[PDB]
């Protein structure tokens, strides 16, 4: 698929989640982001579709206090405004 | 399915992972245990089938430093020696 180049901040989160590249496909970006959320345990204990990022860089990146993985559209928009190139 | 009654220690781990009962089926015990491991992040970052419990009560409970989720037989044996009743 097409390669995307994340901004420095998004790149640092993916890297801390184990990514080794600087260019990925959207599926790798999504995969690595779930690992970051998992490792940091930002999701809600009871309602596990809610991710709380108020005091985490993910909140600075997306600019929200939280989000639902059950709202795919808003999520993709937050990721997209954070790709310096959606076609590398 | 049959109900099992975990020992006090195993009970405290399940409870901390969100369990509300004192009697469960083996599937609930397994479900709650994965949540405990998940919440505490005891699994290995790279080889995610390896659970490190050397400095966690799970290690005291099982009596091991680690284990592989890829060895189902040893796991069930560790759980079984920790049920005061495998039929409640």
């Amino acid at each position: 698929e097409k390669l995307v180049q994340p901004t420095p901040l998004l790149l640092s989160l993916l890297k801390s989640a184990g990514a080794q590249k600087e260019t990925f496909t959207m599926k790798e970006v999504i995969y690595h982001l779930g690992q970051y959320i998992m490792a940091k345990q930002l999701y809600d204990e009871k309602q596990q579709h809610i991710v709380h990022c108020s005091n985490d860089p993910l909140g600075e990146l997306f600019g929200v206090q939280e989000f639902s993985v059950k709202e795919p559209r808003r999520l993709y928009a937050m990721i997209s405004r954070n790709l310096v190139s959606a076609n590398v | 399915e049959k109900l099992v009654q975990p020992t006090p220690l195993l009970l405290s781990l399940l409870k901390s992972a969100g369990a509300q009962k004192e009697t469960f089926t083996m599937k609930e015990v397994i479900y709650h245990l994965g949540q405990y491991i998940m919440a505490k992040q005891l699994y290995d970052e790279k080889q995610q089938h390896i659970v490190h419990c050397s400095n966690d009560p799970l290690g005291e409970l099982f009596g091991v430093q680690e284990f592989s989720v890829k060895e189902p037989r040893r796991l069930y044996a560790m759980i079984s020696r920790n049920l005061v009743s495998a039929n409640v």
Partner: peptide, 11 residues
């Protein structure tokens, strides 16, 4: 349904 489950269903 756990986080992993939902994340894995991303449309």
């Amino acid at each position: 349904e756990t986080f992993s489950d939902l994340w894995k269903l991303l449309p």
